[PDB]
């Protein structure tokens, strides 16, 4: 995350790290068996921790749990990060509590204005900001007509911007399948951009208000 401010611990209790030695993407708490994340972050397996806030120390709410599961998206195409989003069974339910609690998926596609969340332990493209420690940004969701403009052709009906053109403020790599919160729900997964918090390029995320189906069918398996 670029020019955020640290997130206050715990204070996205669905934020959750995915770790193969070394956190490499972020995730999002659905409900205790399921976890949301970008489906280029995708690997047979991998290590859901959960409860963390500095990510190289313990401080007693993380859990950690192994996948048992990982679903792409069916259209998922590496070519464009088209439909970049995936699903992860965990091996055991999570033990939910203040620490670890799941976001409700979207009830309705976000309008463009609307301010978000977006947190992680990616970039921060800082010497003061402490990236071990989960960094929080607000960001509003652009318009397509922006979207395409910053990206002419490369945006898909399963992605939308948010963020800035100013640039100076953005989610980054690291940060990548992590959560995108407006109005209590999870509105996106983080996925692409040029560069980050670079004027013109804004945040890609995935759209997954347009996926609610895909969503709850896989998550009954
Ligand atoms: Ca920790």
């Known amino acids: 995350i670029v020019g955020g401010y640290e997130?206050?611990?715990y204070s996205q209790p669905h934020q959750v790290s995915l770790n193969s030695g070394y956190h490499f993407c972020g995730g999002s708490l659905v409900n205790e068996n399921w976890v949301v994340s970008?489906?280029?972050?995708?690997?047979?397996?991998?290590?859901?921790?959960?409860?963390?806030?500095?990510?190289?120390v313990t401080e007693g709410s993380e859990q950690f749990i192994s996948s048992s599961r990982v679903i792409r998206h069916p259209n998922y195409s590496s070519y464009n990060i088209?439909?970049?989003?995936?699903?992860?069974?965990?091996?055991?339910?999570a033990t939910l509590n203040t620490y670890v609690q799941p976001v409700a998926l979207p009830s309705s596609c976000a309008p463009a204005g609307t301010m978000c969340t977006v947190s992680g332990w990616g970039?921060?493209?800082?010497?003061?900001?402490?990236?071990?420690?989960?960094?929080?940004?607000?960001?509003?969701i652009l318009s397509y007509s922006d979207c395409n403009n910053s990206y002419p052709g490369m945006i898909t009906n399963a992605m939308f911007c948010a963020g800035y053109l100013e640039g100076?403020?953005?989610?980054?790599?690291?940060?990548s399948?992590?959560?995108v919160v407006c109005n209590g729900e999870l509105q996106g997964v983080v996925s692409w951009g040029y560069g980050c918090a670079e004027?013109?390029?804004?945040?890609?995320?995935?759209?997954?208000?347009?996926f609610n189906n895909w969503l709850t069918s896989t998550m009954a398996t």
Do not use: F, W
Not at 38 to 56: D, P, S
Not at 123 to 140: E, G, H, R, Y
Not at 168 to 175: A, L, N, P, R, V
């Open 82 to 93: 088209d439909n970049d989003i995936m699903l992860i069974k965990l091996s055991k339910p």
């Open 38 to 56: 970008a489906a280029h972050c995708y690997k047979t397996r991998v290590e859901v921790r959960l409860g963390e806030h500095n990510i190289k």
């Open 123 to 140: 970039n921060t493209m800082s010497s003061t900001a402490d990236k071990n420690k989960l960094q929080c940004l607000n960001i509003p």
């Open 168 to 175: 100076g403020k953005d989610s980054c790599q690291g940060d």
């Open 177 to 179: 399948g992590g959560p």
């Open 199 to 210: 004027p013109g390029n804004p945040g890609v995320y995935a759209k997954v208000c347009i």
């Open 7 to 9: 997130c206050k611990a």
